[PDB]
Structure formats: C-alpha cells, structure tokens
Amino acid sequence: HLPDLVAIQRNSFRWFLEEGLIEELESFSPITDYTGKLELHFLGKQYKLKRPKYDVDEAKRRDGTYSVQMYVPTRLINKETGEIKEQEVFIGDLPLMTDRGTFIINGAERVIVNQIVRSPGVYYKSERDKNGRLTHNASLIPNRGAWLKFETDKNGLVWVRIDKTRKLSAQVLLKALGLSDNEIYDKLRHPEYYQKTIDKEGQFSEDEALMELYRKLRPGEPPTVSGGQQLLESRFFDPKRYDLGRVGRYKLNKKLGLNVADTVRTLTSEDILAAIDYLINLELDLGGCEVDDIDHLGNRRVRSVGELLQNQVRVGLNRLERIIRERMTVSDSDSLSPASLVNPKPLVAAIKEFFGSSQLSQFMDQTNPLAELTHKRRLSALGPGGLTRERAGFAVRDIHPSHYGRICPIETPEGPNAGLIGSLATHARVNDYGFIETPFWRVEEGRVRKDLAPVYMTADQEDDLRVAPGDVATDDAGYILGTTIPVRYRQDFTTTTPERVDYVALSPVQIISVATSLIPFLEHDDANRALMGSNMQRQAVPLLRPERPLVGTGLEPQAARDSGMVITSPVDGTISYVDATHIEVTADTGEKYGYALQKYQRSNQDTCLNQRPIVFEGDRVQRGQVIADGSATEKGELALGQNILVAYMPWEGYNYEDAILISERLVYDDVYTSIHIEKFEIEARQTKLGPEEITREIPNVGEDALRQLDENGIIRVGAWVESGDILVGKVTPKGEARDVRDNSLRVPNGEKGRVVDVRLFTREQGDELPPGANMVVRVYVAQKRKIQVGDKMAGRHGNKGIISRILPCEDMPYLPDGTPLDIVLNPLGVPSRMNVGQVFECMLGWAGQLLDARFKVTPFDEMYGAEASRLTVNAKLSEAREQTGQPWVFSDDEPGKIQVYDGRTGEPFDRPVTVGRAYMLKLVHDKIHARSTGPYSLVTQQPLGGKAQQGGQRFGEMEVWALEAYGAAYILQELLTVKSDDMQGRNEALNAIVKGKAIPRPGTPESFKVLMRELQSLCLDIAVYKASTEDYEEDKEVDLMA
Amino acid sequence: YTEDSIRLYLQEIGRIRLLRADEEIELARQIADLLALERIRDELLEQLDRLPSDAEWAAAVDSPLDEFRRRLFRGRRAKDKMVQSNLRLVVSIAKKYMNRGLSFQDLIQEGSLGLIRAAEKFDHEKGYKFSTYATWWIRQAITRAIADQSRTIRLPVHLYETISRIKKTTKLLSQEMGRKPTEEEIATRMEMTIEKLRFIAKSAQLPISLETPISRLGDFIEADGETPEDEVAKNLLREDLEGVLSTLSPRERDVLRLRYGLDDGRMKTLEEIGQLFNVTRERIRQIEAKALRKLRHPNRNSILKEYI
Amino acid sequence: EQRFDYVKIALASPERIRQWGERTLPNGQVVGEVTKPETINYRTLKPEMDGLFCEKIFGPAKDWECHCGKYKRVRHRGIVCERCGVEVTESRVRRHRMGFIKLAAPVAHVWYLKGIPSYIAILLDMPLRDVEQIVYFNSYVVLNPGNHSELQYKQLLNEDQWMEIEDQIYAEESDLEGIEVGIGAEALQQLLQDLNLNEESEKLRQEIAESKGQKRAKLIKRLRVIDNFIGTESRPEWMVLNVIPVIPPDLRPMVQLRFATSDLNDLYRRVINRNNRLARLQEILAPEIIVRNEKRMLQEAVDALIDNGRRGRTVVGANNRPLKSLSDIIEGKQGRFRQNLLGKRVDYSGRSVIVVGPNLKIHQCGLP
Ligand SMILES: [Zn+2]
C-alpha cells in the first residue's frame, strides 16, 4: 500500500504555491504611509507565474537556476483624489521544485531538508528542589514571537517571566490585560490558590499594573500607563510580531480545552486564564491534568520547504514594506506609480540566501537512487530554530517510544550527528498540521478489516488504544491467530487476548526506513550492523553493468521509481524507435510518445547518471512496463552491487581484521568498475596590469605538450589527459614580449581520463559571468575505475572491508566443479558482530544461482513458522540440488558447507566451508596524500592543510605527548620547528638534505613570534630575557624579531 | 542600572525639553553675536600671530572684561542649548540609515556634527523653522559619513554617485526595454567604455571576512613568498655561473660582474668602471665583448642553456 | 648557548607602547602613530600613508622597493626615500613592526575591569558596578570631597545629585570650596594615581592583624594585589590606557582572492574613527553630552578590540557573526596556543588507507 515515497517534499511546495504565498502576501497587503494619503493594496490572491526561462536541462547544463517570476496585481489608492493606478508589479524570482522533489540552484541539485522542531502550544513541567516540594511551571511557545513562562513558587505564588526578564506575579499581567477580579475569579476553578498570590502581592489595578509592567520590562524610564499598554500590545497582541500559528491554536485548544476560532492566532485573555487554571489544577492534582513530554512526537512538528520558504518570504516582505513606506512618505508629490513604488531586491535577496546559503537547503546526495531518495525523506533536529550540537544531549538523541512507525530506529549517522538526523519510516506521512502519522488496520472482534481503508493515526492518538504489530499472523479472511498478542498501550509493551486489540500495523517493515527495508534477513542481524549496512547502502557506486540481487527484499522496484531515473511506458502499445539517446512508443491506437535519455551526466558526488533503454525495436509493450533504466537499476528495481561467489574462511592473513581478499575476475570481467566524472574550472580575470588571455602561446613549453589543444588554448573533447597535462592554456600579464606568465589549468596529480565536455561561457555570449571575470571555461573529465587494493567493499548487512589482495584465479580456492571463488571473507568477523543474516543470503543466493531464480524475501518472515528463514533456505537448497543433479551442491550433514580445494597446491581444506552468492557493493571515494614542501598559512607560516592544495598532516598535541613519552627530543624538535614554521630553518634543512650535509640547529618558530606580538598588542609587556653572566650587570632583553 | 548604551543615550536625550520657535529665534540672535565676536578674535589672532588674551579681546571690543566674558558665556550656552535640544531630531533622522555600513550610534554622532554646523549657519531673519534647515545639514553629514566610513576599502563620494547613477540607468532601461539590459547597452547609455563599467562593478564589491565558513576561509589561502624549493634553484644557479666565470680571465670576469651587478645588484655603466678600473671608457666595452665571445662558445658554458 | 633564558610579562606602560611603535627617521621625523582609518587604495591597491597598512610605519609592501617608486632593487639598502620617506628594505618587517594609536581620552583595559578578580575594583576598594558606571559615564565620582559635609571621597553622584551640588556650589552664599568630581576613565586614572601603595599596605596590614572572617580575606586580597604592585614597581594607573598598540599588518592580512580582510581591521577602524571624531568634538567645543557619548563609544570600541563581547554587546560583522578580537585569537581550542604552538601541521607527511600485510615483518611497513 506504499504511497509516493517523496511526498513530504511535494505536498509542502504544492501547499506553498496554493495557499502559503497567498497568506503572506495578504497578511502585508494594505500598506499605508504615515500621513494616510496613499495606500498600496496587494491583491495577492491573483499572483500569476511566468513560465520558466531556459529549461530544467538548460539550467543544469548552463549552471543556472530553475525558477519563475512572480507578478502580483496591486492598486495604489490616493486617500483623497481617489486616483487608483492599477498595475502588476514584479515581486521576485521563485525557484521551482522539479518533478523529483528537488530544486536546481546555480546549476546544482539541492534539497530542502525537513526540520523536526518543538510544536507550538503550552507545556507543563514539574521540577523538584533539593529539599523542597514539587513546583510546576508552564511554558507557552508560539510559532513566532515571545514566550510566556508561568511558574509556581514553593509558597504557592504564581510568577510570570516575560522574555528572559525578572519575574512578576500573575496579578500584574492579568490586570494589565483588562480583566476585573470577578472574571479571573470565576474562570479559575480553585480561586483560593490564586487568592493567596493576590493577598501576598496586593491587588493591582489596571493603571498600576501597566505602570509596574513597564517598569519591570524597561527599567530606567518613567512608567506610563499608555507606555505599558503599548508594550503589551507589541509583545503578545501584535499580529505582525506574535503568531501562534494554526498548529499553535490547535494545540492550545486541544490542551487547555478552549473553543477559540482557528483564525485567531494571537494570545487572548481566555488563553492565559485557562493556562493558569491548568497550572493550579496540576498543582492541586485535580485529575485531568498532566505534565508534558517534549520528546513525544505528538508535541513535535515537521517543517518542510513550504514553511521555511513562507518565513523567508515574510522577512523579505517586511523589508520591502519598510522600503515602500520610506519611498512613499518622502515624496512630496503624488507622481508615484505602483511599479516605481515596490523594490523586489529584499525579497529576491531573502529567497536567494535561503536557497543558496542556508543550512536547511543542502547539496543533494546523489551517489545512487537510494541516497537520493533518503535525502528527501530526512528529518533534522538542527538548524535555524532547532538544536545545536553542543546543546543536544543524551535525551534528545534516543528512541522515544512515540517513534514507532514514524521515524526509523536504525538509519542514522555515526559520530557527532548520531541521533540528531533520522529517516522517515516506510508508511509514515506528515499531515497538514505537521505531525507524523502512520497507518493501521482496524480490528473488530479480533478480525483484521483489510476491506476498509487504512486508518492513519498520530503519536498522541495511538496512546489509549491497544495496537498490535504488523507481524501478527491472521488466518483465512482476517481473524488473528494465537492466544496472546503483543500490543502497545500508553507507550508500553504488553500482551493481550486477541479480542481486545484495537489496531494492527499494515506491514512488518512499517517501523524501519526505506534503506533499512532493503536488507533481507534483517531480523537475524544486530541493530548496529543493520545501521552500518543501511548507511553503507547509500554510499554504493553505480557500476558499469548493474545486476539485481538474487535475495532481494521486494522494495527494490519501488525504491527506484521515485528517483525519477527509470522510464516506464504509460501506454499499451508498440515500440517504434529505439536508440542510445531516444525511445519512441506508438500507442496501440493513438499518438506517439517520445523520451530522451540522459547519457553520461555527472552527479553532485561525481558518479555517473546514465540512462539506457531496455526494449528493442518493434516490441509489444504494456502500460507500466519498464522502458529505460538508471545507473543503479537493472530492470525496474534497484541494483547497487553484484552477486559473486563467496566463501567464509581465512586466507594466509589476507582476511585479517575485516580485510577482504578477492579474485582477479572482478577486475578483468569489469565487475565493480564505475564511471566517475570530475569538473575542472578556469577563470579569465582582469588584473590591474591587464587582462588574462586563453591562448596556446604558453611560455616555457614545447609543442610536444600542446598536441590536444583546439587552436584556442583549450583541450579537445575526446582527448586522453594524464597527470600534469594542460587542460586550458592561460597567460597572465605579470609585471617586472617576454612579460606573459603561465598559470594554465592542468590535471591534478593522480588524475587521468577522457575529456567529455568543454563548455565555455563569456559575457558576450549572454552568460552571467562573475563580477571580475571575462571567461569561464569548464571541463569535464570522465574515467573508469576498477576495483583495486585499498577500495572499500560492503554488504547489505553491515559487513564492510578493505580489499588487501587481488589473487590470480588459479590461486583462489575452487569448487568441486572447477569454479574458482570470487571473494574469501573471514568468518571471525561474523559471530562477534552478530550479522548472521549474511550467512542466510549467501546460501539463498547460492540456491538462486543454481535454480535460475530470484527470491523476494521480506524482513521478519518468521510470523509464518518457527524458523522460516532456515527452512526456506534448506528447502531451496535441496530443490536446487535435485534440479541440477549435482550432489555436491548441498550436503545433509553440513547444510551450508561444501568442499573447497586449494588453488595453490590442489589439496582440499580439512573441513568444508560456507560458500554462496553474496550481493556486495563498492563504496565511494582519492584519499592518498603526501607532501614534502608546499604552500603555507598567512599568519603562522605553517603548511596549509588539504589534499587539493598539497597540504600537510597535522601533528596534534596527542602526538606530541606520544613523542614526549618515548623520550624523543630530536624528532619532536625537528617536527615542531624545522618542518612546520621555522621560516629560515626550513630552507636550510632542505638545502642540507639536497646537498647532503647535516641539518643545522633550528631557531624560534614563527608562531611563537606571532603570539608574542599579539600579546604585546593586548597591552602586555611580555618579553624574552637573557640573564646577566657577571654580578653587576642587568639582564638584557633579547630581540627575537631580528 | 541598564547595560545598554543606546538606551542610556536616549534617556540622556530625553532629559532635555524641546525648544519653541521664539526660543529658537532668541538663541539664534545670541549665536550670531557669538559668531561675530569669534570672527573678531580670529582677526586678532591674525594680527598677533598668537591667541589674543581675554583682556586684549575685550579691548578689541571696547568692552569691560566682565561684560565681554559674560556675553561670550551667554553665546556659548545658547549654541549649546540649540544643539542639545535638537539631538532628538538628529536621532529621528539617523534612524533611517541603520543598515548601510555605520552602526546606529555612529550615525547619531556623525549627524550631531551636521546639527552643530546647522546651528552655526541658521538665520532667524529668514523666517523659517530650525527643524527645516537643520535637516539638510544632518542628512548631509550622515550621508558623507557613510560615504567615508562604511567600507574597509573606502570609495570616493563620486564613485558612490556613479554607482547610484548606473543602478538608476539600468532600472530605467529594464523598464523601457522590458528585459535585463546588456553590458554594452548600459555602457552606451552611460556614454562610458565597458571596461570602466566592469572596473566600477569590481570596485563596488564588499571585502569578505577571513573567517567565513567554507572551517574558515583564512585557512585555505596560501602565503606570498618564495617556495623553499624555488630558493634552491637560486643558490645552485649562481654557482654554475661563477664556475663558467672562473674560466674567463680575471679582468674579464670582474668586468662582467660589475657590468651586470652580480655583487651589488646594481648594473654599472662603462664610466664607473672607466674611473674605478685602470683604463677608461671604450676599453671596458672591448673587454665585455671579448669575454662574452668566450662564453658564447659551446664549451665552458652549456648547462645554463637549460635555465632559459 | 641559548639566546634567551626566561620570559617575563609585566603591565605595559604608555611609554613602553610608544617605544614599541615609535621609530625615528633620518630626516628627524618620528613615525609610528596610526592616524587615519584607511587600509588600501581602491584603484592602485597600494597602502595609504597614515593608515592601518602604512608603509612609512610598518614597512615597504614590496621588499627593496620604495612606495613612490624612486628606489628599486637591492642596491638601495637602508636608503629611506625622500619623496615619501619609506625605508627600502625587506617586506618581512611588515610582520614585526607595530606602531601605536594615541587616544584623545583615556580608556580602561577591559581585562582589568571585567575579570573574575577585578583588579581596578580591588585596588580602589569599590564594587565592580560602581567602577563600570563611572567608566561608562553613568555616574560621577567625588575626586575630592573638598569642603562639603555630606560628600565623601570616592562617592557616586547621579546626574541630578551633581546638578544639586552645582546649584550649591554656585550659590552666592556658599563657603563650599575645593570640591571636584569626575566621570569616565579619566576619573579612574585620577583615583589610581591617588593611591599611595606604601601607606595602603601599612594600613591594610594593621587592619588585617585586628581582623578575621571574610573581612580578613578581602583585606588579604587587597594586600596581595598592592604588594604585587609594590614589588613590580608598576604604577596602577597603567591599567587605564592612554595609547594602544597596533598589531603588524601581516598578522591581520588583507589579501586579494575580492579582498579577504581580518576582523582586526574593522575593529581598529572603529577605534580610529571614534578617536578622530572625539578629537574634532574637543576641538570645536561640542555640547558636553555629545562629547561624553563619544568617549563612551571610544571606550566600547577599545573594549571590543581587546575582547569582543566581554562587557557589552557583541560587534557582529557583515553576517551576523561575532568579530574575532585579540582575546579570541589566544584562547580556546582554536586559539593560538592549542592550534599552532602545542600542535602543528608538519611537512614530509602523508596519509593513506591501511591494509594488512601478512608477509611483512614486525619492524617493516608497506609504503606505496
Ligand atoms: Zn619614495
């Protein structure tokens, strides 16, 4: 029943376009100047949209932005003359969301992350003193504005703490609101508790209430009744400075039991009085009151591109209104038109900053369709309005029972981000208030009603019901089998009779995410290794020829249709034109449909986004049938790895501690080879001496290194470039003909491949070049990488490894039929890591290879039997043995083990080993770095850091301690001074090494001199001294800076 | 006991009551008297080449020292009150540029100078309210201060005016043509070369701080200097040159070293060696040619051929 | 055998700061005072003459080349030009020379004002709030009780109270003579100059003898600070700054990628701008409130330079982020000590993935 997987990102933009921008335009529409003579009305319900310029593909290839233009009709009304100059004004450029849920900003694909924040409303909490009783406080939190904290003292006093200022008894606030004693006495249920505060703090009247409120809020100024009134109105009553939100109003009504309309979004007297009454009742233990949990998913909300955009648009609109008022009052003549009144610079700037430089808009993860899919379904606890890494603690990063079926308990990062970024579960969805829901089937008298439609439910809703998991087994029709059934009641796990179960989860994978739903035999894995496998499945690399798993899980065809890279026919007809770049299908009786396929493009992570056709010319095709496939899909479904022969046994030390020993077939059969495309860029600028020219007249170079340039100084498409090869030839006019200097762009050390695209952008061609540049040349270089020593290989169950040896296939162990193995894995890593599921897949994959079959096993498959996975695997292996005819395939004494021989000597190993077909992946990432001497930092004169600029390795203080514990003094002193920042000792050491002499003694490193200068610059007379040798002499200050 | 500084200044301002128009006229007369008296003293300063004493200044006004000093005081206090009671106007005008490069407190203190000048040049006889004349001076002082103190790489006022006119022309062309104007179109409309327009665009940029997250920007910028590696092809070279120089006759090599400044970095003429060396000019030229001809042979100098 | 033996740190006197920054020229002109808040010329990209990157103060931008171009090449060593007076030498001196800034009004070093022990407060035996109010122009202080009866030495006077005192002192019948009040860091400097350390030490010792409890502890702390000042032979008024040092320009580089500038340039420009405006206001006899507000602004600017955000609001940059002041450079995990002195990035280093070599020996490694 899986709906659209990337729908949290669409619904929020469809909502923004439909009623998110309108609400914000109308909220600021009537702009009036101070004289009240001119008025600007923004008829924001009629904003039209201009068709996007360029195209999606054109924006991508031009390195531009995919956007539209917004035009709202406006009417400037003269308050007297009454002349109304109706017009349509340009408001801004709105980047548009593509069909895949993403945006194209500056020619790069970006995704707006979803932020999990605390929902607006009122939250009660009880705090316990070291020796005192329980004291209760309440926090009222709006969508946007100031917070209202209430607190109960140890003596029974009620305090309010506007903002972060000092407290003030609640009587001041209630009287300042314009409430007499009788109404606040009647609304409260236990009035004597508040009467104690009234007596202790004195009954304030409205005038003195506002005086004291102004005095406490803004000390040092003479109090003024009007001053206070205005302060309160601006603080909690101003529609443009306090917004509860729709969710805030909903939560307030639900918690406090009010009935206020949904349209009012500011605090009202009723609200504060109710909140106070609830606090009093909670203090007195009335019965219908309860403190709040802030980690509950019923008190937490999800914001997506629509809300975050709305807020940015609101800020821009405030700035625009300020500019409009300024450029409206100044005018002494009504010669202004609405076109000349609005300035779209602040709104354009706000939207651009949000989409390009915010920390909620993120560079897309695009290694494969799975990473792309889970990047759009990600929930973050960090950002402008959430948490910070140093403030997030143990409580926030844990699994709250209310995550069941809404947030995956497995898929997270490892490290500083553990528990702060999560993934939406498989069936979960977000409703229009911002709370995550999840579907259930209704159960009537122990019968699961799959005929009726799934009933979705939020975290707070499913707290009073007894909900059964999705792995409960039912008989024919729907009755639940068994006598005891696990249920969840009030965030607890219990067991009940199957006549008292209210709801049942839709699927057994309803609790996990999509990446974790792709791991077969998951219930035989530890949770940590499941986390590793789910994380590593999104780092796999699309291979040269992908291949489906044999023991897939059933969600592969659905995990690939959302990335928008697989083409399916919507039409039940015939195929008339097939090509490497075009497919055409003619409807049985109808029009022709034509599709263009992307070819060897480049992703954010330098992988390849190819697209290939599957069908042949003149082929009968049905609707919904796969027509073309992506770079990580085979025929409809995800394909991230390859199926290879694996045996579990140790080699001669090559399996030691997670290392992997593979065969040479994975290299020459082009298994686990991939295409990676990189981009290089060169800029022609204009220096004060002169401009920079792209030409082949490069100094100090011979014609043997200008072979592949295109008589314009730029390399040619289809040329093989090795390291140090010139890509674009550039000359700078240096100042000291024989005047030009060479700074042509070259391939970095360790890079090679073919040149596939050389795009050129100059201001003449109508391109948006940078401010000071006169030509931007971009070159794309593609290469094919094979598996090699040092690469990371992985499985779906968390078993990672680094390849340490590639053996010729006549050295690898072989089977009783002569087939050498492909990979040998250490079994020492299986039982201590508890990822037994890998030992099941192999075996089932073995059967699948022998039976020419593909198995779709779903996780948690043991609801049908006592040991379902083992029985299915054994039966499948026996069936494969009977069909093939070879008895060595399967043995009854050792089911999963068969005999394996030694390729080096021909002798069989002492005991049979476990062999099978395993689905292994090749992980991304270029890490080898070395340095002798290179660039240095500006202030400290220490070597720079970074692979791309010949950077050095940092010798931290832990390494200094390690060298101090060894007794090393000369290694430490050479590392600290001569090799880092002894500005004169570096050259002397290098010259001594080159000449072959001894390295001289070092001096004072430059960072010490920098520190002494900075300390002197702090008005400190710190200095270095040389002690006097004889008696009647003064110590002499030593000049280091000489 | 608040910690805010702006609020404290606003309170200090509010302790002063606004003037009335008659009060403005009265103070203006005393201010004019003070100005004339100051001009006279300035005349005494030109005559004395020193600051005149109060007695000499009183003597220059034929006034008793007491009367003169009290008149001076009254004038000082009048100007003081005229500025003091209008600081509220200064704040009211300065609040309209709080996001242009200067902090709010800087705008206030720079507009105070304009208010002082306005109070120095206000004419009661004009028959106008001081709040009309003072606004011009306050606005001018604040605008000049922004032009001269908002950027690290300060741009001249004419450059700000040029940028503003370029923006206005670009908007006018966009409105007229219904599309974004090109560089050439704008350059033609401004009647200036495209290179000047690009220079203006490049100079208008704001300097990015070194601590911009990329991790900071300042940790990705190399340092200006000679790579330790490029200093070792310098010591090496000289030696090779010196070797081939040794082959030449002593006088010849000395001539060459001096004619190229290999010792002092300074190339010397003929005539300095004509005087310093034994024989005069037109003799060193022959030595230079007879040395170079020796070096130009493929023998005794062929390594340096690769240095080119 | 070693160049230096010990590192000594003391309280900097204004004479020492001037010595650090003042260097004389062959013409007889002394240089070292930064007077203009100008960094570089927009068109020539050449440093200004009396700014934060001046070549006449800090050193030539290009080694062995004059600012005006009169002298070039090494040949001219130690030849200060005449047209512009720049010393033709190596540009490295731009990271050693300091120069100074002279202040129109004295300011307080925020380190000795806002600290866990407040040395200004401890020496003056005044609460920190009173000292801050006097410094930031929120209250007056009675520098001399004079002849008044209800006025005590070092007593805080509000503006209204001072106006009442003024009315009393300007009454035709007042016998009141010799009363003095002050506001700002100048008042603090006068109070610090008043302290006679020897007499304060003797009085505190005598009082400590006849004391116990918290009173004894506080007098002990005062005596410790006073005795430290006696031993160091340093005058306590040196905690009030009259001149400030300027860091060498290469330690606050203004490089061109756009121009990337250190936050010290902006902080120094604020200090220079406010100092120049204060000098102008003191030259035209501005109204007293305006001058006092400018002095408060100068104090705040120097505070933000020494340690941004320690006392008042935090000076944000172009983006809403704090500017990195002088104190932020030498503290924290990203400070100088822990990022560049106790641990460095070193040359002759590489990094790579490790695989298992089973045939290697224990004393061997496999290097690609
Ligand atoms: Zn010169």
UniProtKB/Swiss-Prot annotation, chain A:
GO terms for biological process: DNA-templated transcription. It comes from the Bacteria. PROSITE patterns: RNA_POL_BETA. GO terms for cellular component: DNA-directed RNA polymerase complex. GO terms for molecular function: DNA binding; DNA-directed RNA polymerase activity; ribonucleoside binding. The keyword DNA-binding does not apply. Pfam families: RNA_pol_Rpb2_1, RNA_pol_Rpb2_2, RNA_pol_Rpb2_3, RNA_pol_Rpb2_45, RNA_pol_Rpb2_6, RNA_pol_Rpb2_7. Keywords: DNA-directed RNA polymerase, Nucleotidyltransferase, Transcription, Transferase. Its EC number is 2.7.7.6. The keyword ATP-binding does not apply. It catalyses: RNA(n) + a ribonucleoside 5'-triphosphate = RNA(n+1) + diphosphate. Belongs to the RNA polymerase beta chain family. In cyanobacteria the RNAP catalytic core is composed of 2 alpha, 1 beta, 1 beta', 1 gamma and 1 omega subunit. When a sigma factor is associated with the core the holoenzyme is formed, which can initiate transcription. DNA-dependent RNA polymerase catalyzes the transcription of DNA into RNA using the four ribonucleoside triphosphates as substrates. NCBIfam families: PRK00405.1, rpoB. This is DNA-directed RNA polymerase subunit beta.
UniProtKB/Swiss-Prot annotation, chain B:
The keyword Hydrolase does not apply. A motif (Interaction with polymerase core subunit RpoC) lies at residues 106-109. One of its GO terms (biological process) is DNA-templated transcription initiation. Residues 270-289 bind DNA. Residues 82-152 are annotated as: Sigma-70 factor domain-2. The keyword Transcription applies. It comes from the Bacteria. GO terms for cellular component: cytoplasm. It is found in: Cytoplasm. Sigma factors are initiation factors that promote the attachment of RNA polymerase to specific initiation sites and are then released. This sigma factor is the primary sigma factor during exponential growth. Interacts transiently with the RNA polymerase catalytic core. This is RNA polymerase sigma factor SigA1. It comes from Synechococcus elongatus (strain ATCC 33912 / PCC 7942 / FACHB-805) (Anacystis nidulans R2).
Swiss-Prot record, chain C:
The keyword NAD does not apply. Keywords: DNA-directed RNA polymerase, Magnesium, Metal-binding, Nucleotidyltransferase, Transcription, Transferase, Zinc. Its EC number is 2.7.7.6. Binds 1 Mg(2+) ion per subunit. Its cofactor is Mg(2+); Zn(2+). Zn(2+) binds at residues 66, 68, 81, 84. One of its GO terms (biological process) is DNA-templated transcription. Belongs to the RNA polymerase beta' chain family. RpoC1 subfamily. DNA-dependent RNA polymerase catalyzes the transcription of DNA into RNA using the four ribonucleoside triphosphates as substrates. In cyanobacteria the RNAP catalytic core is composed of 2 alpha, 1 beta, 1 beta', 1 gamma and 1 omega subunit. When a sigma factor is associated with the core the holoenzyme is formed, which can initiate transcription. This is DNA-directed RNA polymerase subunit gamma. It comes from Synechococcus elongatus (strain ATCC 33912 / PCC 7942 / FACHB-805) (Anacystis nidulans R2). The gene is rpoC1. The chain holds residues 5 to 375 of 624 of the full protein.
